Amino acid sequence: MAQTVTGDVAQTQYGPVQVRITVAGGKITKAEAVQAPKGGRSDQITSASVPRLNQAAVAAGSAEIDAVSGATYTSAGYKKSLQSALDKA
């Protein structure tokens, strides 16, 4: 069974983060931020951080992933949204 699930939007101090994943036989095979902080240096931080989070979500198969340093708000919002996705099953 393969399925795509979108997690709840996490409000952060720098704006919304929202993660979507494909799970296939349970494991994460695709990860993306549907929403991420934008505007000003938040673009730089988003650019920096979310591709790394995405990669770490696909490698982890779980929301037990490490916060990106210097992007702790975005990372915390990413994991909450990703955990939300996993919980939807």
Author numbering: 1 to 89
Sentences from the paper on this structure:
Herein, we describe the biochemical and structural characterization of two multi-FMN-containing covalent flavoproteins, SaFMN3 from Streptomyces azureus and CbFMN4 from Clostridiaceae bacterium. Based on their primary structure, these proteins were predicted to contain three and four covalently tethered FMN cofactors, respectively. Recently, Méheust et al. discovered by sequence analysis a multitude of sequences of extracytosolic proteins predicted to contain multiple covalently bound FMN molecules. Such multi-FMN binding proteins are thought to play a role in extracellular long-distance electron transfer paths similar to multi-heme proteins. The crystal structures were elucidated, which confirmed that the flavin cofactor is covalently attached to a threonine.
The second domain of SaFMN3 (SaFMN3-D2, residues 157–244) and the first domain of CbFMN4 (CbFMN4-D1, residues 26–109) could be overexpressed as soluble proteins. The SaFMN3-D2 (9.4 kDa) structural organization consists of three β-strands forming an anti-parallel sheet (residues 2–6, 18–24 and 27–35), followed by two α-helices (residues 41–60 and 72–87) connected by a loop. The FMN-binding site is located between the N-terminal parts of the first helix and second helix. Most prominent is the hydrophobic stacking interaction of Tyr14 on the si-face of the isoalloxazine and Ile45 on its re-face. Furthermore, hydrogen bonds are located between the O2 of FMN and the backbone amides of Tyr73 and Thr74, the N3 with the Thr74-Oγ1, and the N5 with the Oγ of Ser42. The phosphate group of the FMN is clearly covalently attached to the Oγ1 of Thr72, which is located at the start of the last α-helix. The structure of SaFMN3-D2 shows that FMN closely interacts with the side chains of Tyr14, Ile45, and Tyr73. Especially the benzylic moiety of the isoalloxazine is sandwiched between Ile45 and Tyr14, which may lead to quenching of fluorescence. The highest fluorescence quantum yield among all mutants was 0.07 for SaFMN3-D2-Tyr14Ala/Tyr73Ala and SaFMN3-D2-Tyr14Ala/Tyr73Ala/Ile45Ala. These data suggest that the Tyr14 and Tyr73 side chains have a fluorescence quenching effect on the bound FMN. When inspecting the crystal structure of the SaFMN3-D2, no clear binding pocket next to the isoalloxazine moiety can be identified that could bind an organic substrate.
